[PDB]
Amino acid sequence: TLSHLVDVVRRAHPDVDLEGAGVHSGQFHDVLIARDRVFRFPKTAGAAAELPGRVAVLTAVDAVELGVGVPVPLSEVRDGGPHGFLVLSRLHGTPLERGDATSPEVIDVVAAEFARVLRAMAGADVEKLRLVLPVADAGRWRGFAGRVRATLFPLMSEDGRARAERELAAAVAMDHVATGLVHGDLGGENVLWQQVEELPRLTGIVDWDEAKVGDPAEDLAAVGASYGPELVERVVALLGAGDLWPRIRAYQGTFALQQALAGAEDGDDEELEDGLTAYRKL
């Protein structure tokens, strides 16, 4: 009832222009994206706990001091609207197009921007983080394999299932690592850049929903999926993370299956179809 929500925002934030404002909507919550501010409004009394959740994650991440922006609660959580609301900062900047990230005159700068964030994430106080964030579970990939075999294997060719079993197996084989902050979805769309005196600067990281105490290889895998091995090799060279390659490849070989399984679970037909194209001939 976006009319109500808009009135809730006008009343609580008079100077917010909702003319030409984003709307993300869901079964879960509505989000009004204004110029400098995001308003999140849960739809259920149970979804309401997401608001202190988001505050606690973003506060914990901000306390690590990554040297780049993350969304900041601009308000306390409020018990106005139907089930509460939270006002977060909007970060400025644009994902780096893959062609731009990799030009010879910027690729070293892009590599160090990723490295300095990933290094601050790897040096987080994990004893503090583990009180707030999810912690990588040793069972995670066994369970994911189980759901992939139940939901997706029937839609695959026999070659699909053989390929998927080897990809699931490389993830199930990994020993449990929980040694720093992990974003969990560190693809290009969640990383925001600005041209700062004619060179890229990494100014913001958004979408901390998958954030955890975990394996730094999982964020390097996502950087590689967005930007290719030329970039991730340079990032890994700078971090001295050459040991992580087997883990990096095991995360990356699960990405199409993660997308397929989420397409099935979320009811996004295009995500399901797109994640499965390697696993069948039709």
Binding site: E189, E210, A256, Q259, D268
Partner: peptide
């Protein structure tokens, strides 16, 4: 969504 993970 999406191939990164989403």
């Amino acid at each position: 969504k999406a191939x990164r993970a989403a």
